[PDB]
Design a protein around this ligand. Structure first.
Ligand code: CA
Ligand code: CA
Ligand code: CA
Ligand code: CA
Ligand code: CA
Ligand code: CA
Ligand code: CA
Ligand code: CA
Ligand code: CA
Ligand code: CA
Lengths: 638, 638
């Protein structure tokens, strides 16, 4: 970076020189009228070149050499080390007339060299390197560069980013470090100051603190901060926090600048002499698919649903997971832990923590927080395992959300949430068709499970055709009078049997139609996830149709299951009993067990004595993040 | 693309098959209970494979072969040609019990194959190719692909895109072609229709017409159109227009879909069976730098400014350009042609036209159209020649706009215009510092000129130091009493001479300060344009300071000049006369003429008898577009 500094006719010029720049110096304007040639002297630590029409020659500290004065003959001035109190850094130019070798005038440049660098960890190893040449840019990929910021959604005691205040030093651990490194003499020369600043636009995206006492110096309603200069080699440590996630209209990128400003006069703005810039990207909110290792199983249910709690506890005891049990709240649905909460995470090189998206129906440390229809529930939000589709890899998987057909006039998840998920970018969301379901959640018809002992996975699909095939076989086998819902006393008077199901003509037509809805989804998943029929297992399911021609479960949907590695908690179907075993249970075992999946059926409905299509319990599994670092992905240009 | 179609127990299935897809067919669900094996037959133009657990074998039209019934044994069904009236395309599956070789039941699939493709010129040669496999994406660069749309800002008789109506067939020439190509029998089977559609979001970005009668079928308040199906090989020609340029919040990309919809029942939404998508990018508004060939010179001035008009006409007569003369209007400034109008262009493979940005102070065919401060004027908007900066090429140059320092609280061009220019992307704008000038326009201090006989160019910078050096030389030479403004009778009583200028102490300090403002710009231009001192010439300039400490010209700014290749119209400076020639004129000739630039001084101030810092005339040159195609650029990720 070349910077212009002119000698003044005939007055001396004093200037700060910032290392990493060099000066081009006009000596011609300061020459008195009539002068012919010029000579120069300079001090030890100042390098000077005479540049005549593009050709440069280094000049000695004390030479007698003379050059013709000319607009195209200039100086180039460089310094490789900062000034100290022992420095006298200068260049002095003498001017000569045609007649005689004694100088007729003199112009000089007194310099104070300083190092100024605003530094961040742009190489993404968690430590702040000195002046990374790439620090002003942000690039994706394994070779990518530039610093990362976490949204500080934490709380120690709204969330931590809600204000401009910092209390716990623990908070600073969530924060990215930014260091202003300087070197120079005891003070800046008269008329200079160093100022950190941000744009008005980024002022709601960031906050910056300086440390027993943490001062908030940039952020909401603070766009600049004058920095105190310390001489010698000094470092000022700053901590930077993100205030919000990428979204519609916010890419995730923010910038912080430091400038050396020169005081000109009263009422004149100060001149930026030198500016250094660092860029941060705020880390996206990321979702964890069923293939990732489980950590904690969160469950909600009424206090007296005893079988559910015993059977969930038993399942979890087969694993290394912890069980967290939560009951119902006045402001939350019976399923709220599944529907109102989604466990994601954020990651930076230095730190990461799980982060919960919380969407209450009505209404900690390193667990972060944050017209409507049923499709806005997080039962309607899933994510696939890592996939490759037509050569394009999605190392974090793809987010799936249920919707309706474009021209249908049907329900759709709110634009605000869809925009949020799309803006995270690294999960490249796909819309499925959930609006044929009364509740409208993708988790009603589909799930993913890992295949034990491999790196592969399966898509599990609800299938009505599988159920009808099975029931027709059992009927052919002489089991037509086999009764469903055994043990649910509130269903007993209905006397529902395989015969009674198979003879219901309108129910058959309804379920053929629902199977078309399932198959439409099957095709989208196969296309957008790069799946073949070998990656899919069909689980028998059955639905009843409402007045809107939407489906609700006839018996509990087995596809919505707790996946803990090889161990699966599967909703107990209460299917027809053949030889004192549920034919639905036996059929599901026959599909899954050969692959090394272990099935545990979990009864969440007995406590209610009947099943009308609604489940009153919910579960959500919190998982370890992907090993793959999000910043190593190269998302498509948006 | 694999699509799911199940045989129905035991009822026949009729389906449309779209070429470019294949069907996976479940034969197991339709089998009666107890059946053991199955056999199949199929017609000549239907290819059938039995796929047993991933392994596929082609099956003959009439074989006797039997396979074990099984959920994992399915059919794969493909067709390579559309159906005609002579077609009977079918697959028939027979089912067998354990005992006996006579079929116990049968299920069948009756098919009608059709070709459906929505086609655009994605390869950017101006003709619409058949089903470009890249047509659903848009990529930058010489190897880039996907179709281009023009904003139809034209008018033949607001602009043409302002409504949904089309009159002149000439209009359709501005429009991009989109063709729906189909092939099939006389009619679609019962229960199907073909529908073109767009998102609500894109409905204000596009419009689509179908042709003596042009019907507007998609656009504002029209999101879908049912297409009439014609049998045999048919093509429906559509014309597509852009309604607006890329902007803040609009990337420039729009999508159009066609779907085959299947009617299910009353109150049920129709099922999209097949969807094809094309994407367009709306061409950006591009600015033309002074290096590009001039076409027309537009000029405005009062009717009686005779010298100006004679001298401009004389200049233009040295070239092949046409002169267009415009006078003053009540709603427009004296400079309006320079300040309120900017001539850009747009280009698509098929067509391009110049497009004017019009910003009236108060208030045709293939010339398109479209708190505030002085910085919003287009005197404050320039563009550099093509440059390369640190290896990064800007083949269309970079847009330059004047601003103030970030922390100054000074003036800045309105966010809406800045956002617009940034969104065009291909000119990668740079902000300079213009706010030290009373009027605040970059064109007051800087310009570009080509170097005749080469591919190179020069930056011209106003310089106060150059003026002081020259005046001090002339004074030393005994010319101190040389008078400026000779012939301007309204300046005569001031008796301004070189001596009087040089002895004004406060004026010297003001101009040293203005030279610091110029040099700050010089450094930004050198940095952001990749320029060295060899690419720059300094023109003498002088300013007076106002109460806000901002500059206005002391004598006419020569840097704002008409550039027609080697020929330059330069504002006549009215500088001090030495030997009956203007010393400013002679000095400027001595700089430019050796490079083969021809200088003509143009007097725009004599008609006013004095110069107070304001010029009452304006010029704007309309130029040929770059040879380089904008879509061949690869802009940085935004
Ligand atoms: Ca580092
Ligand atoms: Ca925190
Ligand atoms: Ca806080
Ligand atoms: Ca924390
Ligand atoms: Ca969920
Ligand atoms: Ca083409
Ligand atoms: Ca038009
Ligand atoms: Ca129109
Ligand atoms: Ca036209
Ligand atoms: Ca302009």
């Amino acid at each position: 970076r070349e910077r212009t500094v002119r000698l003044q006719y005939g007055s001396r010029v004093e200037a700060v020189y910032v290392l990493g720049t060099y000066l081009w110096t006009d000596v011609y304007s300061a020459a008195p009228a009539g002068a012919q040639t010029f000579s120069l002297k300079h001090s030890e630590h100042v390098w000077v070149e005479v540049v005549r029409d593009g050709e440069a020659e280094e000049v000695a500290t004390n030479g007698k050499q003379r050059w013709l004065l000319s607009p195209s003959t200039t100086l180039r001035v460089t310094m490789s080390q900062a000034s100290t109190e022992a420095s006298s850094d200068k260049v002095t130019v003498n001017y000569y007339d045609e007649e005689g070798s004694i100088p007729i005038d003199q112009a000089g440049l007194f310099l104070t060299a300083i190092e100024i660098s605003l530094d961040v960890d742009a190489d993404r190893d968690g430590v702040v390197e000195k002046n990374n040449p790439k620090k002003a840019s942000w690039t994706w990929g394994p070779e990518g560069q530039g610093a990362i910021l976490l949204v500080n959604c934490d709380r120690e005691t709204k969330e931590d980013c809600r204000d401009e205040k910092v209390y716990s030093k623990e908070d600073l651990k969530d924060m990215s470090q930014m260091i202003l490194r300087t070197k120079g003499p005891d003070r800046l020369p008269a008329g200079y100051e160093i100022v950190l600043y941000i744009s008005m636009s980024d002022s709601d995206k960031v906050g910056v603190f300086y440390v027993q006492r943490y001062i908030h110096i940039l952020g909401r309603r603070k766009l600049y901060h004058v920095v105190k200069y310390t001489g010698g080699s000094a470092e000022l440590l700053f901590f930077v926090e993100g205030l919000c996630f990428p979204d519609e209209g916010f890419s995730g990128l923010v910038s912080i600048h430091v400038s050396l400003l020169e005081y000109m006069a009263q009422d004149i703005p100060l001149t930026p002499i030198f500016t250094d810039t660092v860029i941060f990207r705020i880390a996206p909110w990321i979702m964890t698919p069923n293939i990732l290792p489980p950590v904690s199983v969160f469950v909600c249910c009424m206090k007296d649903n005893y079988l559910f709690l015993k059977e969930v506890k038993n399942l979890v005891e087969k694993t290394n997971c912890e069980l967290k049990v939560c009951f119902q709240y006045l402001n939350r649905g019976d399923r709220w832990i599944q529907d109102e909460i989604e466990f994601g995470y954020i990651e930076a090189p230095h730190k990461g923590f799980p982060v919960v998206l919380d969407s209450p129906r009505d209404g900690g440390p390193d667990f972060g927080y944050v017209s409507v229809t049923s499709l806005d529930s997080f039962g309607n939000l899933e994510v696939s395992p890592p996939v490759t589709v037509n050569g394009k890899t999605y190392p974090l998987g793809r987010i799936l959300i249920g919707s309706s057909f474009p021209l249908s006039g049907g329900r759709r998840m709110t634009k605000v949430v869809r925009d949020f998920l799309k803006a995270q970018q690294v999960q490249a969301p796909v819309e499925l068709y959930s609006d044929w379901l009364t509740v409208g959640h993708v988790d009603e018809f589909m799930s993913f499970v890992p295949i034990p002992g491999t790196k592969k996975f399966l898509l599990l699909m609800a299938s009505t055709s599988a159920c009808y095939k099975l029931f027709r076989e059992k009927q052919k086998d002489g089991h037509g009078e086999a009764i469903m819902f055994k043990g649910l006393g509130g269903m007993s008077s209905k006397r529902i049997t395989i015969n009674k199901i198979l003879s219901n003509e309108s129910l058959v037509q309804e379920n053929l139609y629902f199977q078309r809805c399932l198959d439409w989804n099957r095709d989208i998943l196969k296309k957008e996830l790069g799946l073949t029929e070998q990656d899919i297992i069909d689980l028998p399911a059955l639905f009843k149709m409402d007045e809107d021609h939407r489906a609700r479960a006839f018996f509990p949907n087995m596809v919505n299951m707790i996946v803990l590695d090889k161990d699966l908690g599967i909703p107990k179907p209460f299917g027809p009993q053949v030889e004192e075993e549920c034919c639905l249970e036996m059929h599901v075992r026959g599909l899954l067990e050969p692959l090394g999946l272990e099935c545990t059926f979990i009864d969440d409905i007995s406590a209610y004595h009947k099943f009308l299509g609604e489940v009153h319990c919910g579960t959500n599994v919190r998982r370890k993040p992907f090993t793959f670092k999000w910043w190593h992905m190269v998302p498509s240009r948006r």
